[PDB]
Design an enzyme around this catalytic site. Structure first.
Site, PDB file in Angstrom:
ATOM      1  N   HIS A  19       0.852  -1.171   0.000  1.00 44.56           N
ATOM      2  CA  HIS A  19       0.000   0.000   0.000  1.00 44.56           C
ATOM      3  C   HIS A  19       0.892   1.225   0.000  1.00 44.56           C
ATOM      4  O   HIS A  19       1.937   1.156   0.659  1.00 44.56           O
ATOM      5  CB  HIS A  19      -0.902   0.044   1.245  1.00 44.56           C
ATOM      6  CG  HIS A  19      -1.675  -1.178   1.460  1.00 44.56           C
ATOM      7  ND1 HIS A  19      -3.024  -1.274   1.146  1.00 44.56           N
ATOM      8  CD2 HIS A  19      -1.354  -2.398   1.955  1.00 44.56           C
ATOM      9  CE1 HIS A  19      -3.448  -2.508   1.433  1.00 44.56           C
ATOM     10  NE2 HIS A  19      -2.458  -3.202   1.935  1.00 44.56           N
ATOM     11  N   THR A  38      -7.489  -5.282   5.630  1.00 43.83           N
ATOM     12  CA  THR A  38      -7.620  -3.853   5.505  1.00 43.83           C
ATOM     13  C   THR A  38      -8.315  -3.427   4.202  1.00 43.83           C
ATOM     14  O   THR A  38      -8.426  -2.242   3.978  1.00 43.83           O
ATOM     15  CB  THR A  38      -6.252  -3.148   5.582  1.00 43.83           C
ATOM     16  OG1 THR A  38      -5.498  -3.478   4.408  1.00 43.83           O
ATOM     17  CG2 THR A  38      -5.448  -3.517   6.806  1.00 43.83           C
ATOM     18  N   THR A  39      -8.745  -4.414   3.437  1.00 44.30           N
ATOM     19  CA  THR A  39      -9.607  -4.130   2.255  1.00 44.30           C
ATOM     20  C   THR A  39     -10.840  -5.007   2.439  1.00 44.30           C
ATOM     21  O   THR A  39     -10.785  -6.035   3.081  1.00 44.30           O
ATOM     22  CB  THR A  39      -8.953  -4.487   0.891  1.00 44.30           C
ATOM     23  OG1 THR A  39      -8.605  -5.861   0.903  1.00 44.30           O
ATOM     24  CG2 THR A  39      -7.679  -3.708   0.697  1.00 44.30           C
TER      25      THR A  39
HETATM   26 ZN   LIG Z   1      -2.493  -5.121   2.638  1.00 41.16          ZN
END
Ligand SMILES: [Zn+2]
Length: 258
Positions: free
Chosen positions: A94, A196-197
């Site tokens: 990220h 985290t998605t």
């Molecule tokens: Zn990630």
């Protein structure tokens, strides 16, 4: 599709299709270093990547994944907070549009330029899809990136990005050694969290290394030339593909180091 990272489909919208976005163990979080406590019960962390078999690199429209052959116990993570063996399946990053943002976890509210996630699944559940229905299904090793000297073990990744510019493109990516992405120290923080998605599933033991790796401005600039869109579609640079820190709620962050 349909979630993304833009103004109209980004992290502030995810809760409408993935209500666990507002759950009790969401990731990432800010790591308040003065509040985190050393945990002398943590056993030594074991990163065993000597027989890792990388296969392919894929632009999935959100990031790029370097995927591994996980059909046998090769590359595994054990020890630390983990009970059991967790098998490496992929890594990805990220990153930001600017060097001052891009990480998902923060350290005393500091944002790093990027964050590497090495994703592993608990082999007691037999496959990844079963592991993500379990509260201890996954372990993600998180590594911060700061901009300064180049990271020689990242360059082979950098130089294939040209070939996977747009969503749905993939390329062969065999014989990549993920050890070349680690820092020197394995000191870490750990806490229970989530993907985290979307789908934001609460299955992850997070292990976040304290020592960042350094990458060069030229390397991260090439990350920022990827595209979120498909070929032949209007160009949307793949930048700022990070989720901000989420409420800590009833969790404690433990430190592996005094
Ligand atoms: Zn990630």
């Amino acid at each position: 599709h349909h979630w993304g990272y833009g103004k109209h489909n980004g992290p502030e919208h995810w809760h409408k299709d993935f209500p666990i976005a507002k759950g009790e163990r969401q990731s990432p979080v800010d790591i308040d270093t003065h509040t985190a406590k050393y945990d002398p019960s943590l056993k030594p962390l074991s990163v065993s990547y000597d027989q890792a078999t990388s296969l392919r690199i894929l632009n999935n429209g959100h990031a790029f994944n370097v995927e591994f052959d996980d059909s046998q116990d090769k590359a595994v993570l054990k020890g630390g907070p983990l009970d059991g063996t967790y098998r490496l399946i992929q890594f990805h990053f990220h990153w930001g549009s600017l060097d001052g943002q891009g990480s998902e976890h923060t350290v005393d509210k500091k944002k790093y330029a990027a964050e590497l996630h090495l994703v592993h699944w608990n082999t007691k559940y037999g496959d990844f899809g079963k592991a993500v229905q379990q509260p201890d299904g996954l372990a993600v090793l998180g590594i911060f990136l700061k901009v300064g000297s180049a990271k020689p073990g990242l360059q082979k990744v950098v130089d294939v990005l040209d070939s996977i510019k747009t969503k749905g493109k993939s390329a062969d990516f065999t014989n990549f050694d993920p050890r070349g992405l680690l820092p020197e120290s394995l000191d870490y923080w750990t806490y229970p969290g989530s993907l985290t998605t979307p789908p934001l599933l609460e299955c992850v033991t997070w292990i976040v290394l304290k020592e960042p790796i350094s990458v060069s401005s030229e390397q991260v600039l090439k990350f920022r030339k990827l595209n979120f869109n498909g070929e032949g579609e209007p160009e949307e640079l793949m930048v700022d593909n990070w989720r901000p820190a989420q409420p800590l709620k009833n969790r404690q962050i433990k430190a592996s180091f005094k």
